[PDB]
Design a binder for this molecule. Structure first.
Ligand SMILES: CCCCCCCCCCCCCCCCCC(=O)OC[C@H](COP(=O)([O-])OCC(O)COP(=O)([O-])OC[C@@H](COC(=O)CCCCCCCCCCCCCCCCC)OC(=O)CCCCCCCCCCCCCCCCC)OC(=O)CCCCCCCCCCCCCCCCC
Ligand SMILES: CCCCCCCCCCCCCCCCCC(=O)OC[C@H](COP(=O)([O-])OCC(O)COP(=O)([O-])OC[C@@H](COC(=O)CCCCCCCCCCCCCCCCC)OC(=O)CCCCCCCCCCCCCCCCC)OC(=O)CCCCCCCCCCCCCCCCC
Ligand SMILES: CCCCCCCCCCCCCCCCCC(=O)OC[C@H](COP(=O)([O-])OCC(O)COP(=O)([O-])OC[C@@H](COC(=O)CCCCCCCCCCCCCCCCC)OC(=O)CCCCCCCCCCCCCCCCC)OC(=O)CCCCCCCCCCCCCCCCC
Ligand SMILES: CCCCCCCCCCCCCCCCCC(=O)OC[C@H](COP(=O)([O-])OCC(O)COP(=O)([O-])OC[C@@H](COC(=O)CCCCCCCCCCCCCCCCC)OC(=O)CCCCCCCCCCCCCCCCC)OC(=O)CCCCCCCCCCCCCCCCC
Ligand SMILES: CCCCCCCCCCCCCCCCC[C@@H](O)O[C@H](CO[C@H](O)CCCCCCCCCCCCCCC)COP(=O)(O)OCC[N+](C)(C)C
Ligand SMILES: CCCCCCCCCCCCCCCCC[C@@H](O)O[C@H](CO[C@H](O)CCCCCCCCCCCCCCC)COP(=O)(O)OCC[N+](C)(C)C
Ligand SMILES: CCCCCCCC/C=C\CCCCCCCC(=O)OC[C@H](COP(=O)(O)OCCN)OC(=O)CCCCCCC/C=C\CCCCCCCC
Ligand SMILES: CCCCCCCCCCCC(=O)SCCNC(=O)CCNC(=O)[C@H](O)C(C)(C)COP(=O)(O)O
Lengths: 175, 98, 54, 140, 55, 347, 49, 88, 115, 122
């Protein structure tokens, strides 16, 4: 309950998801995904994962720049749609907002079971560790162990990326 | 499960729903695929950080890598379809029936 | 005095897009002989711009 | 989900015909809703009013079949004084089948539905009596 | 009445008619992914509650 | 496409499947599926011809959706138990999500819609690969997690696949759509016995693969993709149509042919588990597959259709490239029933 | 005779024929030796001979 | 299914609706056999507009030739019947 | 907490500047004044029409190359491991395959813009 | 379910464990081996038929290779199958021995003491 920071950030994450899940103009959809990426970076930072949050935010900024460039070329639609420009898009957006608020209310003051398990709230601060030691970042050491433990992971990831270059060059060849 | 986990799972469900309910633009659906990847990344990072599984800290990064390969694939296809129709509408993909 | 073998009127029953033609499905057409449809010559418009006077 | 099946199954056969008929009507209405959902998804109805009309038609047909089946099967099991007899389910089966024929307004569908729904219902009663398993848990 | 009409009607002709109708219903999909991905959504939702909500 | 590029894409597809098959970590299985799909997309587009682009886009969307649900199930399982090893799937919601993702990947009903379209839109070699090699990885995953699989859901999808494949095949004049619906029905047969015995699943997969390879190679040999185009083959190569007729009869499941062995072996297994209604319905439903195989046999081999004059020129030329494994595949798909007990070598 | 001299003709490809026959005889010899070894090992383990 | 089996009666009804939708023609005065120039006092330019209205109504291009002769509604009906192959 | 205050302060300052810019001066907006600018003559078509990308393949390639910086960014921490021989082999392996990807795209004319 | 997939002491990809050497090998005149050879001969005949060659006498070296390969594979296939059935029998007997209360030996009455109903046919 303290400062409700994590809950606010997760709610904004869901709201951004609703925004691009409404399927309006891609320029707008891209903006909603950028908002979600930044807010998810904030969520991960609030848990000790600085590197992972920053990396995902950077990756999605680059990907959304490419998507914007592609939208101006192949998804232009002379009158592009905002959330209030069409009854279907507005209806989907309102449905998403209402469904999120209903789930939050049902899980907040009482303790309902939705699909898997239940929740009482209590704030996400309860489940922390209390561990007190270290001259390093555990997240950084875990990510850096990719080059000593994850040799097989590096092999398959590098092969997949090289093959991805070959594959994209094959698909767009045409003829 | 705390409220943050359910918010992340709801984000994944909204994105999956967004992917499934097609409108007109193909790119709008590729964006929902990207959103599903983002939700998975956040969920797995939260679980991994919480339980202090140090080795697992590299798996979301891996999860990101194959997210790009899937996006770059999709955009590639979106080019060819557009080059056939001058439009990325999924209505045009009706040459093959069931 | 000859065994009956199928003729054109018999063979044409299998030439359709579907085995059982239906009011809606009778307008389906068989695929091209090679799997190549006529090129959809979509008019990709060239942007028109005014360069000058100002 | 599973609750609707046990709501029907918990009531003893030739008793409380109103509650048995209500449970069967709920099961039929759920089946009609599922059919309507899939039909609307795979064959769009060209406007919202037509979709609502088609959904209402399918759901009402299914719920009517369920109500008639439950009512006649319970009544037959109660007047003949012979519960645990598949003939009650056969009679309910053509109750529902004739209802379907009336709803679609055709005699041939009605007679076919008598035969097939009655046979299926009698078979389901036999399976309940003898413990036949549709989905069998693995044991060997 | 019996051999050429009704015995044909009950066993083989009824079976052929039913299978033909079911085949036409199953195979008459226009090939639009917007329709059967919505079908997929309905299927997924049913599985989560009908078979998943009672284990 | 360059032959070296084609070769390396084929090796990448096979490598992704083998990565799925040798992994104990869920993340590596997911990576294997991703790597398989990435190299699979350009193979479907080898000949450009916009129908191939449509088939590749539909396949990509289906498989990417399935991959996302698979990853979500993996993460849910990890959340409820800090486990990455592929095992009995400690969470039931995760198990349902995983089963649905794998059913989408295999094309089981009701996730079956994409198979006929993608198969019709690609070439016959691509269809051969899609309907034979692409089933190995998902079925190998399902064998591993079979103990935690919910029988009611898996068997519902199996019965739906058998019914829908049988009904859909009846309406088809195109050979690739017929093959797709046959594939859906055989997938349903494979997955019906999976919760009871994975050796029967493997046996059915192997017999189906040899039969499908023989059928696709016989359709490549006589460059026919329609019923009327196949009806000309009696007047150019009668032996090919005779072998096609025997293979079609075997695919139908008629004894004493090879096709019969899996069904015979599955029904028996289901009777040891007190399942009687299910095998009876499955066996009676397989008669639809037999019917639309018999109709093709009538068209191509058991009667002679009219031919064309230019066919005379084709009488002067021979099939240049030969498929070395076609004779073995035909014999294996027909005359193998007397060696049924050797199935014990699969467990 | 033929118009194009049809390169695979009355003199067969003797390298391929030799390889095929050598493979068949090698497989047969290996199989007989393997069966002899299997019988000897089976009798040795079971205390028969 | 595609468009219904259009008949001559439908063609005549649509053509007469188009003519009665024209401002320069009083509705109840015009008949099926009324010559455009003589009966309604319509100039050559007016006829051009009417033919263009027919092209919009029935969705097919009527060349400048074969439009110089459609001078009464009945000839329009005959021309559309010939172009669309309608006999009954 | 300090960074959140900093972000709020920066956004508030920028928004206040926009508000002053829009509310302080005298506005005389009319139709000719607000019309789109194309050098004195009215635009022919819409600015919302498809605008071709000639570097589309480089843009797709940038997506994969951008993900490789994510794999190479933890390299400073990986140099602190005891298995330096294994680490250095993996770091060089990833950069060699990255260069090979660029070599394949370059030789196969992938870096040339469409005409 | 996999009945023997995880049997203790099982080598992952062996195809023929050492203990299988304790079993009598199949005879070279095994009727199953003769059927494998017949399958190879049929494969060779079909090979001649598809290639449009004289079916019975076209390539004797190729037909011989077909027969030899089929017989060679069938021998090891038969060895593995026989070993796997022997393992099943071994485990079933050992389990019956180790669970006597689950397979109780029942003293059997004679037909003079059993009372079977008689159903006349008339
Ligand atoms: C963990 C796994 C679980 C994951 C899932 C969990 C979900 C959690 C999140 C939920 C929140 C969702 C947030 C965003 C979702 C995005 C929605 C979206 O993108 O809509 C696209 C989709 C297509 O958009 P479009 O192509 O631009 O518009 C075309 C016109 O709508 C069409 O023009 P028209 O005039 O020709 O047609 C009128 C209209 C009218 O629609 C109808 O005819 C249906 C009327 C049914 C009456 C009840 O449409 C149709 O006739 C075609 C059928 C489509 C109807 C919607 C199908 C829903 C399922 C089918 C069952 C329907 C109910 C039957 C009874 C079952 C029990 C309720 O929009 C719609 O289909 C309708 C609006 C949907 C909004 C509600 C979403 C919930
Ligand atoms: C090797 C083995 C040998 C066996 C193989 C061969 C034999 C088996 C196959 C042959 C029998 C199968 C036929 C069954 C019904 C098929 C109907 C049909 O095709 O509809 C399409 C066809 C096309 O309809 P549509 O084109 O859409 O509409 C235009 C109409 O055609 C034009 O409209 P409309 O104005 O001209 O006529 C319509 C209307 C106006 O009707 C009429 O115009 C004339 C009157 C027709 C009905 C008269 C029935 C009343 C008197 C009969 C009493 C029983 C017989 C005598 C027993 C003596 C006992 C010693 O009809 C009605 O309203 C009648 C409604 C229902 C009343 C009858 C149902 C009573 C059920 C019997 C209960 C038995 C329980 C056990 C008893 C134990 C003791 C024996 O509909 C008809 O035209 C036929 C309707 C007449 C159906 C009733 C006649 C069958 C009576 C016995 C049925 C039992 C056989 C099945 C056993 C299993 C079922 C549970
Ligand atoms: C339970 C026990 C039983 C288990 C059963 C298992 C399953 C059984 C089989 C399942 C079904 C199989 C279906 C196969 C479909 C294949 C599709 C196909 O090839 O098209 C059909 C093809 C159509 O031919 P066509 O259309 O007339 O030809 C026109 C061309 O396509 C026109 O194209 P073109 O002009 O481009 O021609 C190029 C051509 C000509 O070729 C060349 O010129 C060669 C050029 C060399 C280039 C070298 C490039 C090297 C650089 C690339 C490096 C890549 C690395 C990737 C790995 C990365 C790892 C991170 O190349 C090809 O045609 C295809 C090449 C195939 C390459 C195979 C690569 C194998 C990869 C192995 C992956 C696993 C590795 C370990 C992974 C470990 C985990 C990480 O004909 C057939 O294949 C007939 C069917 C053949 C099926 C064989 C029967 C089954 C197997 C029987 C043997 C025994 C099997 C059991 C072994 C047991 C273990 C010892
Ligand atoms: C429990 C059972 C126990 C025994 C099993 C018996 C079952 C069969 C055996 C197993 C499978 C055999 C497969 C290999 C044969 C394939 C070759 C072939 O096609 O035949 C053509 C070939 C004739 O070619 P050619 O003489 O060189 O020159 C004439 C031209 O080729 C002119 O040729 P063409 O191409 O121009 O003629 C056109 C013709 C060409 O069409 C055909 O040739 C049809 C080929 C049939 C395909 C077989 C499918 C694979 C096997 C599956 C069988 C399923 C068994 C289950 C029961 C159901 C039966 C359907 O097309 C048609 O006429 C259209 C008619 C369509 C009717 C549809 C029915 C077809 C399927 C029926 C198969 C029944 C068995 C076939 C008997 C052999 C022939 O026939 C033969 O000469 C070979 C036949 C067998 C050779 C025997 C040599 C052994 C020598 C004696 C050794 C003594 C042993 C003891 C030692 C100690 C003695 C003291
Ligand atoms: C450097 C960054 C930080 C800056 C720090 C200072 C922040 C400055 C605030 C930014 C806004 C600058 C605007 C300055 C001009 C005032 C504009 C506006 O607010 O005044 C009028 C507001 O009056 C409105 O007409 C409404 C008046 C009453 C109706 C609602 C107000 C209710 C408040 C009650 C007031 C009664 C007495 C209250 C005593 C406390 C609107 O007139 P309008 O023509 O459109 O706008 C053009 C202004 N022109 C003419 C100078 C060009
Ligand atoms: C139509 C008939 C089927 C044809 C099949 C293809 C024919 C060619 C044979 C393929 C050659 C490869 C097999 C033998 C090479 C080495 C095998 C070894 O390395 O692998 C062993 C495996 O051996 C193989 O399983 C045996 C292959 C034998 C296949 C033939 C059985 C066919 C069924 C009977 C039908 C009649 C066929 C007769 C042929 C004419 C390891 O066992 P294991 O790793 O622990 O099991 C893995 C799967 N588990 C764990 C899930 C159980
Ligand atoms: C629930 C699912 C039920 C599945 C049960 C399947 C029953 C087995 C019979 C299946 C045969 C289906 C054949 C069919 O319907 O085709 C309709 C067909 C349309 O024509 P085409 O074949 O497409 O070609 C010519 C037209 N251009 O019409 C016909 O010509 C029919 C001719 C064949 C009829 C033979 C059927 C004989 C069946 C006798 C009774 C037994 C049926 C099986 C079930 C028995 C009861 C348990
Ligand atoms: C948006 C608004 C801006 C306006 C755009 C500016 C348009 C300028 C176009 C100028 C082109 C001409 O004058 S073109 C020259 C036109 N003049 C002639 O043809 C001379 C002979 N006159 C006749 O044929 C008849 O009087 C006639 C009435 C024509 C009908 O003919 P019918 O007997 O067969 O009905």
């Amino acid at each position: 309950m303290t400062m409700y920071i994590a809950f606010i950030l997760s709610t904004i994450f869901v709201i951004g998801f609703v925004g691009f899940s409404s399927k309006p103009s891609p320029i707008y959809g891209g903006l909603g995904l950028i908002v979600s990426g930044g807010v998810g970076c904030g969520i991960v930072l609030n848990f000790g994962g600085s590197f992972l949050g920053l990396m995902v935010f950077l990756i999605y900024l680059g990907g959304m720049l490419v998507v914007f460039g592609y939208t101006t070329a192949m998804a232009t639609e002379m009158y592009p749609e905002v959330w209030v420009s069409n009854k279907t898009v507005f209806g989907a957006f309102v449905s998403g907002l209402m469904m999120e608020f209903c789930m939050v209310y049902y899980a907040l003051k009482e303790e309902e079971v939705e699909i898997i398990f239940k929740f009482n709230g209590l704030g996400d601060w309860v489940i922390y560790d209390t561990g007190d030691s270290g001259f390093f970042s555990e997240e950084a050491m875990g990510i850096a162990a990719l080059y000593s433990y994850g040799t097989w992971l590096v092999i398959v990831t590098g092969w997949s990326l090289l093959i991805g270059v070959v594959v994209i060059m094959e698909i767009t060849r045409g003829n | 499960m705390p409220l943050v986990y359910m918010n992340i799972i709801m984000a994944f469900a909204i994105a999956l729903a967004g992917l499934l309910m097609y409108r007109s633009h193909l790119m709008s659906s590729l964006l929902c695929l990207e959103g599903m990847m983002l939700s998975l990344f956040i969920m797995s990072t939260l679980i991994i950080l919480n339980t202090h599984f140090t080795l697992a800290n590299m798996m979301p990064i891996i999860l990101l890598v194959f997210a790009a390969c899937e996006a770059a694939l999709g955009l590639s296809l979106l080019v060819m379809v557009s080059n056939t129709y001058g439009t990325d509408y999924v209505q045009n993909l009706n040459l093959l029936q069931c | 005095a000859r065994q009956w073998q199928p003729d054109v009127e018999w063979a044409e029953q299998f030439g359709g897009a579907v085995m059982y033609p239906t009011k809606e499905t009778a307008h389906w057409k068989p695929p091209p002989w090679n799997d190549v449809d006529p090129p959809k010559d979509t008019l990709v418009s060239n942007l028109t711009l005014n360069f000058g006077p100002q | 989900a599973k609750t609707l099946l046990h709501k029907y199954s918990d009531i003893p056969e030739g008793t409380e015909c109103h509650r048995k008929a209500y449970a069967s009507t709920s099961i039929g209405g759920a089946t009609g809703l599922i059919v309507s959902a899939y039909s609307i998804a795979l064959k769009p109805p060209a406007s919202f009013l037509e979709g609502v009309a088609r959904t209402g038609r399918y759901t009402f047909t299914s719920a009517a079949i369920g109500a008639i089946f439950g009512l006649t099967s319970c009544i037959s099991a109660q007047v003949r004084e012979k519960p645990d007899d598949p003939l009650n389910y056969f009679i309910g089966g053509c109750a529902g089948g004739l209802t379907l024929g009336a709803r679609t307004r055709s005699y041939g569908i009605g007679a076919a539905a008598c035969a097939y729904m009655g046979l299926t219902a009698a078979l389901v009663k036999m399976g309940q009596l003898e413990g036949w398993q549709v989905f069998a848990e693995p044991k060997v | 009445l019996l051999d050429l009409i009704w015995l044909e009607t009950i066993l083989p002709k009824t079976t052929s008619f039913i299978q033909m109708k079911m085949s036409i219903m199953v195979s008459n999909q226009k090939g639009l992914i917007k329709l059967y991905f919505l079908s997929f959504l309905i299927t997924i939702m049913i599985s989560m509650t009908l078979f998943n909500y009672h284990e | 496409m360059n032959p070296i590029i084609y070769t390396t894409l084929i090796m990448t597809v096979m490598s992704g499947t083998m990565l799925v098959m040798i992994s104990s970590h869920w993340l590596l299985i997911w990576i294997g599926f991703e790597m398989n799909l990435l190299a699979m997309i350009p193979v479907l587009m080898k000949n450009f011809n916009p129908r191939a682009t449509e088939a590749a886009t539909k396949y990509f969307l289906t498989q990417a959706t399935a991959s996302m649900m698979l990853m979500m199930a993996i993460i849910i399982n990890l959340l409820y138990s800090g486990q990455w090893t592929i095992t009995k799937m400690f969470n039931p919601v995760a198990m349902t999500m995983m089963t649905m993702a794998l059913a989408m990947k295999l094309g089981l009903s009701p996730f079956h819609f994409w198979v006929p379209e993608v198969t019709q839109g690609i070439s016959l070699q691509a269809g051969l690969l899609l309907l034979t090699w692409q089933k190995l990885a998902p079925l190998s995953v399902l064998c591993q997690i079979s103990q935690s699989i919910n029988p009611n859901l898996m068997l519902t999808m199996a019965m739906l696949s058998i019914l829908i494949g049988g009904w859909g095949g009846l309406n088809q004049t195109q050979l690739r759509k017929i093959m797709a619906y046959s594939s859906i029905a055989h997938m349903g047969w494979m997955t019906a016995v999976l919760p009871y015995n994975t050796t029967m699943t493997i046996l059915n997969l192997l017999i189906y693969i040899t039969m499908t390879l023989a059928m696709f190679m016989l359709l490549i040999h006589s460059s026919a993709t329609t019923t009327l185009s196949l009806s000309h083959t009696w007047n150019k190569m009668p032996v090919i149509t005779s072998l096609m007729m025997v293979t079609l009869l075997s695919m139908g499941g008629l004894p004493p042919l090879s096709g019969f062995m899996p069904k015979w072996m599955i029904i028996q297994e289901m009777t040891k588990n007190e399942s009687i209604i299910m095998p009876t319905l499955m066996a009676m439903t397989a008669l639809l597959n037999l019917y639309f195989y018999m109709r093709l046999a009538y068209s191509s081999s058991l009667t002679m259709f009219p031919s064309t004059n230019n066919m005379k020129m084709k009488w002067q030329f021979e099939h240049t490239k030969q498929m070395k494994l076609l004779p073995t595949m035909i014999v294996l798909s027909t005359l193998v029933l007397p060696m049924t007990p050797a199935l014990s070598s699969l467990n | 005779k033929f118009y194009i001299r049809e390169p695979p003709h009355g003199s067969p490809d003797w390298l391929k024929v030799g390889l095929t026959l050598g493979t068949s005889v090698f497989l047969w010899i290996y199989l007989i030796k393997q069966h002899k070894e299997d019988v000897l090992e089976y009798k040795r383990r079971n205390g028969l001979e | 299914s595609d468009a219904p089996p259009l008949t001559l009666e439908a063609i005549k009804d649509r053509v007469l609706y188009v003519l009665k939708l024209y401002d320069k023609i009083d509705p109840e005065k015009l008949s099926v056999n009324s010559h455009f120039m003589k009966d309604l006092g319509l100039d050559s330019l007016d006829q051009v507009e009417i033919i263009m209205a027919m092209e919009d109504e029935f969705g097919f291009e009527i060349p400048d030739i074969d439009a110089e002769k459609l001078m009464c509604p009945q000839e329009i009906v005959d021309y559309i019947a010939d172009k669309k192959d309608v006999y009954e | 907490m300090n960074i959140m205050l900093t972000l709020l302060t920066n956004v508030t300052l920028a928004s206040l500047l926009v508000l002053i810019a829009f509310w302080l001066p005298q506005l005389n907006a009319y139709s000719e004044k607000t019309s789109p600018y194309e050098c004195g003559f009215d635009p022919m078509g819409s600015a919302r029409l498809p605008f071709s990308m000639k570097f589309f393949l480089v843009a797709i390639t940038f997506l994969l190359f951008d993900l490789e910086i994510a794999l190479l960014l933890p390299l400073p921490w990986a140099s602190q491991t005891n298995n330096l021989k294994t680490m250095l082999t993996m770091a060089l392996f990833l950069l060699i395959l990255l260069a090979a990807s660029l070599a394949y795209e370059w030789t196969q004319k992938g870096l040339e813009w469409a005409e | 379910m996999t009945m023997m997939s995880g049997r203790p002491g099982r080598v992952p990809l062996q195809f023929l464990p050492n203990e299988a050497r304790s079993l009598p090998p199949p005879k070279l005149t095994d009727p199953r081996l003769v059927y494998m050879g017949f399958l190879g001969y049929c494969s060779g005949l079909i090979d001649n038929a598809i290639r449009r060659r004289p079916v019975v006498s076209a390539g004797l070296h190729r037909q011989l290779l077909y027969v030899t390969s089929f017989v060679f594979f069938g021998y090891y296939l038969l060895k593995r199958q026989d070993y796997m059935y022997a393992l099943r029998d071994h485990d079933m007997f050992a389990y019956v021995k180790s669970h006597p209360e689950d397979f109780p030996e029942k003293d059997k009455k004679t037909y003079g003491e059993i009372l079977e109903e008689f159903h006349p046919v008339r």
